[PDB]
RNA sequence: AAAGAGAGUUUGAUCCUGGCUCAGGACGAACGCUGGCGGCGUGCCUAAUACAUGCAAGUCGAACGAACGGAAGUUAGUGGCGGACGGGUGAGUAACACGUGGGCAACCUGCCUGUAAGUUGGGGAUAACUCCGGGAAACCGGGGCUAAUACCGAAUGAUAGAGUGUGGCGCAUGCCACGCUCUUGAAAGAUGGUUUCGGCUAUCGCUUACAGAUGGGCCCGCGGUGCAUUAGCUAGUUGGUAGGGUAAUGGCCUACCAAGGCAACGAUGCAUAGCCGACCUGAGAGGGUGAUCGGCCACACUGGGACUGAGACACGGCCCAGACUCCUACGGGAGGCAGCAGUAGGGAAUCUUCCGCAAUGGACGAAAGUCUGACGGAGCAACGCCGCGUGUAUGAAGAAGGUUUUCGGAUCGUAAAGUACUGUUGUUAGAGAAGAACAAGGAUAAGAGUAACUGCUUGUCCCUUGACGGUAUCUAACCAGAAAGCCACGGCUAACUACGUGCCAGCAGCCGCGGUAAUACGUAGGUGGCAAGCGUUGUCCGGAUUUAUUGGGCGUAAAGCGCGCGCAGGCGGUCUUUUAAGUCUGAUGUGAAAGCCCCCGGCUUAACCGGGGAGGGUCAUUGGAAACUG
């Protein structure tokens, strides 16, 4: 992808459970390196900013340029901008790939967009940073179609969005709506960030 | 002498020229009088959008086209009316 | 200096090799203890060596990558 | 709708005033360690220092005078047009140079378009060439003969000049239209059709005149640097009367008369600087800058002058003087990279002696076409801004190994190994776009003009061509294999332990660390920030309310003249009528294109391009209101 290293690492330092639920934090829920059972102390407003950004962008897996330029971008909206930003990081085409269930996790679906295995309206796009929109289709256009690694990740599925409509006998997947930040993930503070980049 | 030129604009190996009425000694991308269109060379048929009117005056008092500006590209009949205008 | 000016600088890291009648580069800065020095001069930049089996911050002193 | 973050350091501790330092953004950057690819851009900021060498401006045989062919066609010379465009640099310049808004009843304008009259007859001579005279030599004269759309007169023709007559007007000098008498004022032919044998003709050229368009010239209001440890400056200077000169007004110049003019609202003098659209920063007002892109100005080794032309006092033109370089037979000759590449030098620092006229635009030509270092493209450089790689999913109370250990462990860590997948990229073999529509030529169809064709204008059909380049793109097979580093970890500021060292070695932006237990020095383990980058230095804005209009102060912290008389200036009690300078407001014109911002669209997305708007002025003409200031 872009950072290639251990994934139970980040989640353990972040405090959250990124990258599915649980099972980074299962055992050992303190932070890396020869400390981290020790303790941890009072951390500034610097530290607390900081750790909600790194929680937004640890979670996509996306570098910084990129986050700030996305974040630049959602300014311009209307409404709020914390909200925009994430609905914004939600469009994005990588990320649709990984909610309509063909990949596992996000480390996966980029790699399988990236290979070009991702069709919108029946056009290939390698780039996982494609910002999809309302009313475009999502498929593989057979070129990978009966592949072990999609026929196993339709199997574990929970349930989809719901504002993503995935028709599994086609494999085509489709965004039914703009989300709202209440189905997010909300084990963060998007005002935090705000005033992060406003310092 | 005033003609009609074409002014190139774009980006490396993606042109697309305008219409303007220049005095054919000023540089090619430089000043020119009046903008009057368009031309893009890449599409199927080439999309071109001239106004009929500004362009009419212009060679009915002098402006002439270059060879691919109007001259060829006159295939919305601008060169007809003229030639209708002239005789009436 | 080349400019006519002569100035006086500082010699960073542990152990030079530059004698008299050498020529070096120098950059802004200033050692504050020291009263006249506020110059230092460039390591590993014309004929200054980079320091001696120098492990981190090795991009200051010049100092190239163990294989 | 937009709307502003603080921290460390004076004390044994306080609260204030006060400086210093740090945290953010940006580069035409450079240096240090590293370095995979693609798209789009950028690249002598210093010596306006000096040039080895290749190219960067020519073209017409359908305007005219020789050889090869055997009847076409090809170059030296006279002539026409171009060389004033295109390209470069920022030296000079504090001024109508530039920006914005106007005047010109005070002006010029080759080529382009439309219109109205003509294109009638003569003459003399010169280049080329041929001889002689110089010089080995580049480098010049004399004798003789030739053509023109070369040159010079003549016939006819002016809204040009003079003397008028008559109207209609303006903003003072004055402007528009008509008629009368005279005076002056031109031309060129070349390629074709034709009748009938004379001429009569098709375009493209020539001459005169009037309109339009384009391009220039002159004048004016307002606007944008520092210094008063720079106060007087000016003698064609200011005005006037005649004249000269210019396309044009004008002390632009001259003869005479007078003694004026500018200036503390900064004259004059010195220093620095091309100006703008715009760029960086800021909550905004502001502050700093004038790379690239576009508009204007100036310059072309230094200084002066003019010729040719519609246009120059002319980058690759001429004359003279100066420094430098190069040939010389010693009488003399030649040159100007701040055009594209490139060399030396200066510097901390900046690129290839590349391919092509296929696209767009120039010059010449009737046209084919010729010339275009403009331009279209390619090489170099992480110099920038975007994009995605170096894999992915499962996988243990957790192997080996490092580090640490209160010796039970903790950590690196699902990380590895193992099992199952993928080919962005890499390797190979295959295909393989657009950018190209013309110009020319050949067919018909219709119009204007003609006594009739040839031809001209317009429409509809054939007709062939790419530097980039086998580049962009696409298909199929193969292997997780080739593809991570830099800085920091005492506080500000996210992230701690072990060994060595012993006020030494050293670190350092500030507070400050090091004197045998150092989270601050050196290494190691792991941790944090960013990632084909990461740091340091230099410069600018911020935070700095630390020049405070928005937005500060003067009893004791820096800061009230020792006090009065007062010119200029600043400000001014109550009411009525009036004006419309300030003030508010409607309309018209403009404030170019690109750039910032809003809305759509096209490159697989993004940077990057395109289309449509808005915004920006103490801006001009004109019409309103009369509360406040005048
Ligand atoms: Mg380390
Ligand atoms: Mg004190
Ligand atoms: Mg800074
Ligand atoms: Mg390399
Ligand atoms: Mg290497
Ligand atoms: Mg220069
Ligand atoms: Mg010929
Ligand atoms: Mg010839
Ligand atoms: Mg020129
Ligand atoms: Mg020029
Ligand atoms: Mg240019
Ligand atoms: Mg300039
Ligand atoms: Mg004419
Ligand atoms: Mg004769
Ligand atoms: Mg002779
Ligand atoms: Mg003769
Ligand atoms: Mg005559
Ligand atoms: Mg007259
Ligand atoms: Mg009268
Ligand atoms: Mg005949
Ligand atoms: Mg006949
Ligand atoms: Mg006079
Ligand atoms: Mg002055
Ligand atoms: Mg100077
Ligand atoms: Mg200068
Ligand atoms: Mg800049
Ligand atoms: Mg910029
Ligand atoms: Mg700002
Ligand atoms: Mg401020
Ligand atoms: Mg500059
Ligand atoms: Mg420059
Ligand atoms: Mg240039
Ligand atoms: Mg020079
Ligand atoms: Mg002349
Ligand atoms: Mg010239
Ligand atoms: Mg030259
Ligand atoms: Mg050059
Ligand atoms: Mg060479
Ligand atoms: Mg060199
Ligand atoms: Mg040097
Ligand atoms: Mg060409
Ligand atoms: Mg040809
Ligand atoms: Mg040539
Ligand atoms: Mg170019
Ligand atoms: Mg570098
Ligand atoms: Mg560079
Ligand atoms: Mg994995
Ligand atoms: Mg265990
Ligand atoms: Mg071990
Ligand atoms: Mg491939
Ligand atoms: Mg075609
Ligand atoms: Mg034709
Ligand atoms: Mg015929
Ligand atoms: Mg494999
Ligand atoms: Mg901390
Ligand atoms: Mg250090
Ligand atoms: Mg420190
Ligand atoms: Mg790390
Ligand atoms: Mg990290
Ligand atoms: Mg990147
Ligand atoms: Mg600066
Ligand atoms: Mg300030
Ligand atoms: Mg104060
Ligand atoms: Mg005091
Ligand atoms: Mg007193
Ligand atoms: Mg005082
Ligand atoms: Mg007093
Ligand atoms: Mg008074
Ligand atoms: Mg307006
Ligand atoms: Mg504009
Ligand atoms: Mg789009
Ligand atoms: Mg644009
Ligand atoms: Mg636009
Ligand atoms: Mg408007
Ligand atoms: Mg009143
Ligand atoms: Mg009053």
């Known amino acids: 992808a872009r950072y290639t290293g251990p994934s139970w690492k980040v989640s353990r330092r972040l405090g959250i459970s990124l990258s599915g639920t649980g099972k980074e934090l299962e055992r050992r829920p303190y932070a890396p390196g020869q400390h981290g059972p020790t303790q941890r102390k009072k951390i500034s407003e610097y530290g607390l900013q900081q750790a909600e950004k790194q929680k937004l962008r640890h979670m996509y897996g996306l570098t910084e340029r990129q986050f700030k330029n996305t974040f630049n971008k959602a300014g311009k909206l209307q409404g709020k901008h914390g909200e925009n930003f994430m609905i914004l990081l939600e469009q994005r085409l990588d990320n649709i790939v990984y909610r309509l269930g063909l990949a596992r996790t996000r480390r996966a679906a980029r790699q399988l967009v990236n290979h070009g295995h991702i069709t919108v309206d029946g056009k290939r796009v390698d780039i996982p940073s494609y910002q999809v929109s309302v009313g475009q289709v999502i498929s593989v256009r057979e070129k990978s179609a009966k592949n072990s690694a999609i026929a196993e990740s339709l199997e574990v599925s929970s349930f989809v969005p719901e504002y993503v409509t995935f028709d599994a006998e086609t494999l085509t997947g489709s965004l039914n709506r703009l989300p709202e930040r209440s189905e997010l993930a909300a084990e963060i503070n998007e005002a935090f960030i705000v005033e992060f980049y406003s310092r | ?88 | 200096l080349s400019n006519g000016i002569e100035v006086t600088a500082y010699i960073p890291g542990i152990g030079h090799n530059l004698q008299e009648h050498s020529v070096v580069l120098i950059r802004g800065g200033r050692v504050k203890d020291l009263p006249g020095v506020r110059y230092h001069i460039v390591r590993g930049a014309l004929d200054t060596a980079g320091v001696e089996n120098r492990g981190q911050s090795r991009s200051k002193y010049g100092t190239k990558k163990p294989k």
Request: glycine residues 6%; hydrophobic residues 35%; aromatic residues 6%.
């Open chain 2, 1 to 88: 002498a005033v003609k009609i030129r074409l002014k190139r604009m774009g980006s490396k190996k993606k042109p697309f020229y305008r219409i303007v009425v220049a005095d054919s000694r000023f540089p090619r991308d430089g000043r020119s009088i009046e903008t009057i269109g368009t031309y893009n060379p890449l599409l199927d048929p080439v999309e071109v959008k001239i106004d009929e009117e500004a362009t009419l005056k212009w060679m009915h008092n002098g402006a002439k086209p270059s060879d691919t500006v109007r001259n060829l590209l006159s295939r919305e009949g601008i060169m007809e009316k003229f030639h209708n205008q002239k005789l009436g």
